[PDB]
Amino acid sequence: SSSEDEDAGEGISVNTGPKGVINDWRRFKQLET
C-alpha cells in the first residue's frame, strides 16, 4: 500500500651587439651594484 519505506649554430660568439647594448647594460649594472 501507500504506507511503505516512503512513509644548430650553438656557438654564436656575438660580435658587436654587446658594444651596442653596453649603455643599457651599465645603466642596469650601476643600480645592481
Binding site: 660568439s13 656575438v14 660580435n15 654587446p18 658594444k19
Partner: protein, 52 residues
C-alpha cells in the same frame, strides 16, 4: 698663388695671416697628418669585433 692666405677672425674675412702673426711650427701639421693617416689606415684593416 697666395700661399699664406688664411681665415682672419679679427678682420672677419680672408687676408694674409703672416701680417696677423698667425704661425705654427711645421712639426704640428706634419705630425698630425702622419698620425691621423696611420690611424685611419689601421682602422681600415679591421673587419670584425670579438667580445672576450
Amino acid at each position: 698663388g697666395e700661399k699664406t692666405a688664411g681665415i682672419n677672425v679679427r678682420k672677419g674675412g680672408i687676408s694674409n695671416i703672416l701680417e696677423e702673426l698667425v704661425v705654427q711650427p711645421l712639426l704640428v701639421s706634419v705630425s698630425a697628418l702622419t698620425l691621423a693617416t696611420e690611424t685611419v689606415r689601421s682602422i681600415l684593416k679591421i673587419d670584425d669585433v670579438v667580445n672576450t
